[PDB]
Amino acid sequence: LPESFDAREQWPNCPTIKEIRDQGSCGSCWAFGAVEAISDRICIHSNVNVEVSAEDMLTCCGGECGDGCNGGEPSGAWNFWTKKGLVSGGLYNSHVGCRPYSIPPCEHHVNGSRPPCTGEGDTPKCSKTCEPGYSPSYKEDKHFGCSSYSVANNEKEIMAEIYKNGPVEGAFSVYSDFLLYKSGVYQHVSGEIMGGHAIRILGWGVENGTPYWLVANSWNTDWGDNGFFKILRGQDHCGIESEIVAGMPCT
Ligand SMILES: *[C@@H](C(=O)N[C@H](C(=O)N1CCC[C@H]1C(=O)O)[C@@H](C)CC)[C@H](O)C(=O)NCCC
Numbered sequence: 001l002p003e004s005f006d007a008r009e010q011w012p013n014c015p016t017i018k019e020i021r022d023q024g025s026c027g028s029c030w031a032f033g034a035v036e037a038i039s040d041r042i043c044i045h046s047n048v049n050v051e052v053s054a055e056d057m058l059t060c061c062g063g064e065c066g067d068g069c070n071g072g073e074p075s076g077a078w079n080f081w082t083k084k085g086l087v088s089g090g091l092y093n094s095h096v097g098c099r100p101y102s103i104p105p106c107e108h109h110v111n112g113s114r115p116p117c118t119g120e121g122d123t124p125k126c127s128k129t130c131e132p133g134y135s136p137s138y139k140e141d142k143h144f145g146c147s148s149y150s151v152a153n154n155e156k157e158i159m160a161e162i163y164k165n166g167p168v169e170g171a172f173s174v175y176s177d178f179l180l181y182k183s184g185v186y187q188h189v190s191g192e193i194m195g196g197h198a199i200r201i202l203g204w205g206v207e208n209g210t211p212y213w214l215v216a217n218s219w220n221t222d223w224g225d226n227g228f229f230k231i232l233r234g235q236d237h238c239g240i241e242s243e244i245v246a247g248m249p250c251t
Pocket residue numbers: 023024025026027028029030031070071072073074107108109117118119120171174194195196197198219
């Protein structure tokens with residue numbers, strides 16, 4: 001495997017790999033790391049670029065994925081894609097796709113022009129309809145996965161999975177010193193644990209001797225390094241290598 005790899009550069013024709021979404025004031029991070037990597041994988045493995053709906057995943061999976069805005073289970077999310085499929089849907093207020101995200105963007109531990117995020121909010125209704133003016137129908141806009149699986153806590157297998165099949169979903173423990181990240185390779189030094197956080201991993205490299213995983217967060221682009229961050233690789237730091245999940249699209 002190369003010393004560095006950035007899936008944005010490797011698949012130029014899949015612009016979802018460069019996007020950073022915003023989960024709003026909702027603990028929907030489990031749903032976001034999944035629909036972002038599922039969008040990327042649809043594009044990498046097609047005979048075609050769709051923004052898969054975080055709304056659909058978030059509201060309609062139910063208890064197999066956990067508990068909506070209160071948090072959930074990442075492999076549970078990849079499973080819903082193979083069983084029920086996912087419709088398209090872009091950013092809040094975009095009117096792109098069947099079911100755009102309905103929770104407003106907010107400032108995540110950073111000051112800016114949006115309202116601050118609050119805690120978690122209420123999970124919206126599972127509405128099986130597309131927005132007005134969109135075609136096809138909800139039922140017809142579903143995209144299915146044909147496999148859902150877990151990747152072993154093994155840095156070489158994770159690197160080979162991203163290299164071969166595209167970005168993956170991961171989860172790690174957030175301590176309060178992570179909230180303040182701006183650049184470089186994050187390593188945890190102080191802070192109260194704040195929760196597990198599911199994100200999308202899309203590459204790796206070595207920044208001045210320190211090996212890292214290139215990660216994309218769902219806290220909008222004004223947090224961290226334009227929404228992305230680097231975290232220490234190879235030592236299962238904050239559990240970053242312990243809960244990798246991925247899956248393959250049909251056809
Ligand atoms: C993951 C999640 O979304 N966690 C929280 C988060 O990212 N939030 C909540 C409000 C918006 C945003 C923020 O802090 O800016 C937070 C607790 C992380 C510090 C969710 O809780 C989950 O699904 N966890 C399970 C993953 C295995």
